[PDB]
Amino acid sequence: MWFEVLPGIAVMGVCLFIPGMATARIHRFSNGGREKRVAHYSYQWYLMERDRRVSGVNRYYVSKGLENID
Amino acid sequence: MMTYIVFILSIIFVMGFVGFSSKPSPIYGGLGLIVSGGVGCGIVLNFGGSFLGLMVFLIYLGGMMVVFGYTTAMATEQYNKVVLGTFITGLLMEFLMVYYVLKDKEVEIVFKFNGMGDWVIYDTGDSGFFSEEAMGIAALYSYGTWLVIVTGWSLLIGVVVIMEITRGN
Amino acid sequence: PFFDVQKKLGVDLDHWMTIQSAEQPHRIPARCHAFEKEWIECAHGIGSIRAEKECKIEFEDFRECLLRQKTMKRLNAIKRQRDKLIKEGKYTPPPHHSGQEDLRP
Amino acid sequence: MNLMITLLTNFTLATLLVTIAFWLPQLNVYSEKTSPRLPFSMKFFLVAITFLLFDLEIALLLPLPWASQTTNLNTMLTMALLLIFLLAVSLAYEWTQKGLEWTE
Amino acid sequence: YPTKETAHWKPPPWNDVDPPKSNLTLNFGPQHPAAHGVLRLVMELSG
Amino acid sequence: SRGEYVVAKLDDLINWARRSSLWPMTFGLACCAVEMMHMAAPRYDMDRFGVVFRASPRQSDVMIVAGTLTNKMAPALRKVYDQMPEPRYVVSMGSCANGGGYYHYSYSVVRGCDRIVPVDIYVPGCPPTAEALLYGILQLQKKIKREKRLRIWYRR
Amino acid sequence: VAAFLKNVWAKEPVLVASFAIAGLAVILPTLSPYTKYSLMINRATPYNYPVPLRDDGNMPDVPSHPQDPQGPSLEWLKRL
Amino acid sequence: MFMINVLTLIIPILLAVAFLTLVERKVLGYMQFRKGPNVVGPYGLLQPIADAIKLFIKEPLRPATSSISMFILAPILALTLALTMWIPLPMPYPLINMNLGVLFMLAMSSLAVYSILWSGWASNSKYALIGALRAVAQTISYEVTLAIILLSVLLMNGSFTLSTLIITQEQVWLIFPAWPLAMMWFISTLAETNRAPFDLTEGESELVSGFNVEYAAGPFALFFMAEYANIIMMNIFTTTLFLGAFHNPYMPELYTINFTIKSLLLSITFLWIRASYPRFRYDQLMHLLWKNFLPLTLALCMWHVSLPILLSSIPPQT
Amino acid sequence: MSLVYMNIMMAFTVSLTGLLMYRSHLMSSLLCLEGMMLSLFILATLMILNSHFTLASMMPIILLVFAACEAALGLSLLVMVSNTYGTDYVQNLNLLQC
Numbered sequence A: 001m002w003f004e005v006l007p008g009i010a011v012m013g014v015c016l017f018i019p020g021m022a023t024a025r026i027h028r029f030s031n032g033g034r035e036k037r038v039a040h041y042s043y044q045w046y047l048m049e050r051d052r053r054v055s056g057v058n059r060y061y062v063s064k065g066l067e068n069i070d
Numbered sequence B: 001m002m003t004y005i006v007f008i009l010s011i012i013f014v015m016g017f018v019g020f021s022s023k024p025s026p027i028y029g030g031l032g033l034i035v036s037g038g039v040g041c042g043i044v045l046n047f048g049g050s051f052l053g054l055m056v057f058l059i060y061l062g063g064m065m066v067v068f069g070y071t072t073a074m075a076t077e078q079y080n081k082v083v084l085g086t087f088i089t090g091l092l093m094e095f096l097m098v099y100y101v102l103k104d105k106e107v108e109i110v111f112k113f114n115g116m117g118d119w120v121i122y123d124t125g126d127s128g129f130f131s132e133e134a135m136g137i138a139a140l141y142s143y144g145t146w147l148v149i150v151t152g153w154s155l156l157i158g159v160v161v162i163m164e165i166t167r168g169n
Numbered sequence C: 001p002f003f004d005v006q007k008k009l010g011v012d013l014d015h016w017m018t019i020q021s022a023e024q025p026h027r028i029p030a031r032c033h034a035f036e037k038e039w040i041e042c043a044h045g046i047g048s049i050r051a052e053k054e055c056k057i058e059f060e061d062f063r064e065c066l067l068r069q070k071t072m073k074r075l076n077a078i079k080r081q082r083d084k085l086i087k088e089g090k091y092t093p094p095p096h097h098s099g100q101e102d103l104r105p
Numbered sequence D: 001m002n003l004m005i006t007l008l009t010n011f012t013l014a015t016l017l018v019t020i021a022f023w024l025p026q027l028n029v030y031s032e033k034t035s036p037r038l039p040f041s042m043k044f045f046l047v048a049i050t051f052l053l054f055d056l057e058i059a060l061l062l063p064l065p066w067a068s069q070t071t072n073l074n075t076m077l078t079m080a081l082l083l084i085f086l087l088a089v090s091l092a093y094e095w096t097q098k099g100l101e102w103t104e
Numbered sequence E: 001y002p003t004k005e006t007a008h009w010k011p012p013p014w015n016d017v018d019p020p021k022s023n024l025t026l027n028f029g030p031q032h033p034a035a036h037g038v039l040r041l042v043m044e045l046s047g
Numbered sequence F: 001s002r003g004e005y006v007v008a009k010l011d012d013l014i015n016w017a018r019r020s021s022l023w024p025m026t027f028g029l030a031c032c033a034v035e036m037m038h039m040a041a042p043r044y045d046m047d048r049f050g051v052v053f054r055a056s057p058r059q060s061d062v063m064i065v066a067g068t069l070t071n072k073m074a075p076a077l078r079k080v081y082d083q084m085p086e087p088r089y090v091v092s093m094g095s096c097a098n099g100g101g102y103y104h105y106s107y108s109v110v111r112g113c114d115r116i117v118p119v120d121i122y123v124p125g126c127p128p129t130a131e132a133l134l135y136g137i138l139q140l141q142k143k144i145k146r147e148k149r150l151r152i153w154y155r156r
Numbered sequence G: 001v002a003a004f005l006k007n008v009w010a011k012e013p014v015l016v017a018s019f020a021i022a023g024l025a026v027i028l029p030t031l032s033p034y035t036k037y038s039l040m041i042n043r044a045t046p047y048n049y050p051v052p053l054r055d056d057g058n059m060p061d062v063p064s065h066p067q068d069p070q071g072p073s074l075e076w077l078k079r080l
Numbered sequence H: 001m002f003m004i005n006v007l008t009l010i011i012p013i014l015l016a017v018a019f020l021t022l023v024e025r026k027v028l029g030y031m032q033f034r035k036g037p038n039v040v041g042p043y044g045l046l047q048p049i050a051d052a053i054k055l056f057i058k059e060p061l062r063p064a065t066s067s068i069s070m071f072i073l074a075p076i077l078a079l080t081l082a083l084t085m086w087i088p089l090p091m092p093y094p095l096i097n098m099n100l101g102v103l104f105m106l107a108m109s110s111l112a113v114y115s116i117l118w119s120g121w122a123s124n125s126k127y128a129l130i131g132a133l134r135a136v137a138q139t140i141s142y143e144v145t146l147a148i149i150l151l152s153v154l155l156m157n158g159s160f161t162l163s164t165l166i167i168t169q170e171q172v173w174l175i176f177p178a179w180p181l182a183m184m185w186f187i188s189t190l191a192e193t194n195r196a197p198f199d200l201t202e203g204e205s206e207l208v209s210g211f212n213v214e215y216a217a218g219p220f221a222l223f224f225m226a227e228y229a230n231i232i233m234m235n236i237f238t239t240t241l242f243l244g245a246f247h248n249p250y251m252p253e254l255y256t257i258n259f260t261i262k263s264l265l266l267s268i269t270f271l272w273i274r275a276s277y278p279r280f281r282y283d284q285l286m287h288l289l290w291k292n293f294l295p296l297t298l299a300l301c302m303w304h305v306s307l308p309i310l311l312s313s314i315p316p317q318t
Numbered sequence I: 001m002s003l004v005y006m007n008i009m010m011a012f013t014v015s016l017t018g019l020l021m022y023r024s025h026l027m028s029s030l031l032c033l034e035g036m037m038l039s040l041f042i043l044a045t046l047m048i049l050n051s052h053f054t055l056a057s058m059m060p061i062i063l064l065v066f067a068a069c070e071a072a073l074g075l076s077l078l079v080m081v082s083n084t085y086g087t088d089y090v091q092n093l094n095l096l097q098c
């Protein structure tokens, strides 16, 4: 009866689920298990490039805390 | 190569203007002005004018060239030596300009121009938690009162003018 | 016919967008705020004829701030001599000009 | 940069699908099928120009989410309501002089 | 002063109004031939 | 051989896709249009076979000639058939489209639509029922299923 | 005036709703008690750096530390 | 690593567009007391594959074209715009997280009329050109209320960033303060994609869709799949902008499932509208725009300007 | 100065000489005129973003709005010319020689 439309809607829902889950896992993969740094403004980009300079390995996501100072 | 990206887009911009200014038809002229508006929007976007480039795509290419193609469809039938000859003339003059300014790193067509890429002339600071261009456009309402008055009045008058002169009575 | 109605009535119709040194939103300075302020405070009141000759130095500094023609010419000279010395093999770039030095902060 | 890669990828996929849609049905060599100004409306042009002028008024109206952050809120609110009022006055004059007729 | 070139010119109209120097005819039928399908209509549209 | 197997599977693929996605251009000439509309009714429901209802006249796979063809609409029928992209198919529906029918000896009736267009399936009746028309469409799909386009291409 | 208002609400309810919503948008911020707080929040949002003053000797209203009592306060924004 | 992300956006777009045809035919089947496809696959699952293979080997139609270059460029531009409308969509993290994503989508949807206009140019008919001008005039008409309703909504957001619009709707759905904007938005997005009851070129009320005349068209499958990419995209955009879901930054798939279910319900609401109403006459939806939607749009635009000032609720800039 | 300024100026002169040399149509003239406007838009925007002069960020929008209203007025003149003469050809606009 009416539930016969549900395999097509289920396939369409999996096809809509794949881009978002995919880009969430990719942003966690390429950023050290965290969210991608959103730099919409120039101050956020300055902090981000400062992270890229202070990490030493040319990667902004390598976070350095209190262990990096004496 | 990638440091010269605004220069490459500006050469594509001049090539597109030589394209539609040769005027094969207003149809292909409109198409050439659309492609030229897209690459000039890219030029604007690569200096940091994100809102102004989206104003290109949304207002210029989004409304006005739509109305030009709309009127070209409606007031012209549905689609040479002189066109292609003036096209290759403009293309050869622009590539000779490119060749001169890349071999000398200096040129003088009317004024003097540097031959390096235009990445050299940028600022080395930040703007904080705002865009300077966005806040200057937000200043249209707070600081630009008289400018809004004359622009809105000119648009109201423009509606009145087009309804008068297209009436035919 | 410059009917100066803005000064007769005391309204600010378009004086605000006129120069870069005016009051800006969120106190944003231009890239040549100081040079333009110096040229304007030089040329104020003295007339255009006296401003062409007595404010030449501030105006040349301000035009060269705007267009950066002498600056880009000097950088062209330094970079062309650098590439010529790489061509002759009399020079090698230092490690702080090759990207292998772990930038400051 | 990532945007330019994405635009080129979308353009490339579109062009590849267009190439498939034009050349793949040219593989199956079919039969050779040998058997065997425009009228002007003023109303189409007036709806196009009314769109264009209202889109210019929209172009004035677009920095309002940024304009609401100002310190001069009396002036900003006045000029905001004044631009939307002039858009409505353009619509009212477009109404009453029979501009919105037969494409209402 | 009528010359060789400027001799074919006429004086303008006195009211400065020139003569203007028609509508669409559509051959029309029903879109999908299921209900009617066998109708031919020769329209004379006016926009 | 390997190439014969590959072209056999590719013929199976294209025949599956063509028979299972038929789009009909029905001519609603006469009473058979009512019974085609019952072949699209919710009892018989041509749309569950992939046979869509109210397809475009231009991108259709089969021209169902459903009604009485007259001498005044013979060039219109042939012009529509000339506009159809291949593979185009013709199902004749009912006796007037088959052979003139109840109006066979008339001065103004084309005696069968096979005098004008090449016909693949003949669906007989006056009117042939919606079930009989759906039988004719399924027999058309069987006729599409046993096409050998790439096998004959490989053997020429 | 109420017969015409019912007449235009019977004939053209879209335009009546349009002029009513636009009339509220015009006249209502002059009557709202919270229109003042819009200004007070927009001017108290620190987009720039609070460039300090050289302590000459007599500036009692200007604090010497952020946690000093004097200076502009945002207790009204925390409370409202 | 980023190209993998671009592909995992744009290929499931094409697969969801393929199966929206199945979902439409099945739901329009069961809403019409009948079935949709259930013979071609198990429960109809092979109907989009069969239909796409059927369309992709079909002959070019009958005629030649007036302009070959625009006949090629109009499907290219339609598909390119219909794929670039997805890249700023926060789902919960967008592919291209740009500051002006709303404005980007408004501009790239304003550019979508060039495919209609250039396909009207490329066909040899002078009547298909008139029909294309009618469709262009319809689309640019409803772009006005798209822009102004969109602006009025983003006055409660603070910026043109689409990713901020998830943060805006954490306490309430934004349809609760702006349901008149939401209902005019939904009907205007319905009228953008030439969707019923506004599909005047695909149906009657049309000078050219008239049983055996001229006008070479392009490949139907590419225009059709660009149209359904536009439909799924505008339903996702309406979902993000009025029915915003809960975002947990440690479990983003909760947001992804939630807005996916809402977007599916909204695309099914498109399917349920098209199986319910007769079409407008062309001047009747011109009337519906200019004399009905647009005065309410300007009135509510004034209200949503003046309202965060009278309530002291101006949203943050950043 | 900057190299891109040469290209935007030369684009303005290209659309100038195209506007200053008619072939047949009036629509081609209006397209060259709006290409001139486009080059003005780009060049003003590059100056204003180049100098970080904040208040003139609203200037290219005002340029765009006024000259697109100008474009609408020119298209309306073209519509009236094409309704009078049947085409938008500029050689039909020749009655003012006498």
Ligand SMILES: CCCCCCCCCCCCCCCCCC(=O)OC[C@H](COP(=O)([O-])OCC[N+](C)(C)C)OC(=O)CCCCCCCCCCCCCCCCC
Pocket (backbone or CB within 6 Å): G011, G012, G013, G014, G017, G020, G021, H180, H182, H183, H184, H186, H187, H197, H238, H242, H273, H277, H288, H291, H292, H293, H296
């Ligand atoms: C976003 C998620 C979903 C949101 C909801 C949308 C889904 C529901 C869709 C239902 C099916 C729609 C299918 C297509 C229908 C197309 C036709 C159509 O929409 O026609 C619109 C009709 C057209 O009107 P009409 O044609 O019926 O009326 C006749 C018109 N005249 C008289 C001119 C001839 O209505 C509108 O245009 C109304 C738009 C929305 C109005 C919102 C008003 C809000 C309330 C304001 C305040 C009122 C109180 C008074 C003042 C108080 C002051 C304090």
Ligand SMILES: CCCCCCCCCCCCCCCCCC(=O)OC[C@H](COP(=O)(O)OCCN)OC(=O)CCCCCCCCCCCCCCCCC
Pocket (backbone or CB within 6 Å): A011, A014, A015, H015, H041, H042, H045, H046, H049
């Ligand atoms: C993001 C998710 C996207 C998912 C998209 C797809 C959704 C649907 C998923 C699959 C559903 C079931 C598919 C069943 C296909 C039909 C199989 C069938 O009946 O084949 C029979 C046919 C003839 O067999 P024969 O041997 O002649 O039989 C005689 C028996 N005495 O035999 C043949 O024709 C030969 C075998 C054909 C097998 C075809 C299998 C289906 C292919 C569909 C393409 C997509 C599949 C999924 C891809 C993504 C996941 C990997």
Ligand SMILES: CCCCCCCCCCCCCCCCCC(=O)OC[C@H](COP(=O)(O)OCCN)OC(=O)CCCCCCCCCCCCCCCCC
Pocket (backbone or CB within 6 Å): F005, F006, F009, F010, F012, F013, F016, H018, H039, H040, H041, H046, H048, H049, H052, H053
């Ligand atoms: C080296 C060797 C290989 C060489 C290259 C070939 C590769 C494989 C090609 C695909 C498979 C070829 C065979 C196709 C089907 C042939 C078998 C067949 O006819 O099965 C019939 C059966 C249904 O029987 P039917 O007669 O319809 O019954 C009515 C209901 N009782 O049919 C069914 O049950 C369903 C049949 C499904 C067919 C397969 C699924 C479609 C193809 C998927 C991949 C291609 C498309 C990719 C995506 C396209 C765009 C979306």
Ligand SMILES: CCCCCCCCCCCCCCCCCC(=O)OC[C@H](COP(=O)(O)OCCN)OC(=O)CCCCCCCCCCCCCCCCC
Pocket (backbone or CB within 6 Å): D085, D088, D089, D091, D092, D095, G008, G012, G015, G016, G017, G018, G019, G020, G022, G023, G024, G026, H294, H295, H296, H298, H299
């Ligand atoms: C001052 C407030 C702000 C005002 C400016 C902002 C307005 C925002 C909305 C934009 C409206 C734009 C278009 C306005 C056009 C008005 C003229 C008009 O439409 O007149 C024609 C109409 C009769 O329609 P008809 O010609 O028959 O068309 C066929 C459709 N069935 O005629 C009518 O139906 C009569 C229309 C006028 C009467 C409406 C009265 C509404 C009263 C509501 C309560 C009071 C609201 C407060 C404001 C005071 C209003 C006087």
Ligand SMILES: CCCCCCCCCCCCCCCCCC(=O)OC[C@H](COP(=O)(O)OCCN)OC(=O)CCCCCCCCCCCCCCCCC
Pocket (backbone or CB within 6 Å): A039, A040, A041, B034, B035, B037, B038, B039, B041, B042, B043, B045, B046, B050, B053, B054, B061, D001, D003, D004, D007, D011, H073, H076, H077, H080, H081, H084, H097, H098, H099, H100, H104
């Ligand atoms: C007939 C011809 C072919 C037709 C088919 C193909 C063309 C049509 C479809 C493609 C349309 C392309 C639109 C590209 C511009 C979109 C605006 C844009 O770039 O916005 C994103 C972003 C601004 O956002 P924001 O976050 O503020 O900036 C980043 C700071 N964190 O800004 C950025 O990220 C800027 C990135 C660098 C600049 C790239 C600009 C695009 C490349 C040049 C133009 C190419 C297209 C030319 C033709 C377009 C159609 C007219």
Ligand SMILES: CCCCCCCCCCC1=C(C)C(=O)C(OC)=C(OC)C1=O
Pocket (backbone or CB within 6 Å): F023, F052, F054, F055, F056, H017, H018, H021, H024, H025, H048, H051, H052, H055, H202, H221, H224, H225
């Ligand atoms: C890439 C995948 C392409 C799938 C194409 C599916 C086309 C839709 C099939 C049925 C159909 C519907 C619903 C439809 O609405 C329509 O327009 C009236 C058609 O064209 C005549 C159709 O054929």
Ligand code: SF4
Pocket (backbone or CB within 6 Å): F030, F031, F032, F033, F066, F067, F068, F093, F094, F095, F096, F097, F101, F102, F125, F126, F127, F128
């Ligand atoms: S075969 Fe008979 S019943 Fe059928 S359409 Fe003809 S006249 Fe009518």
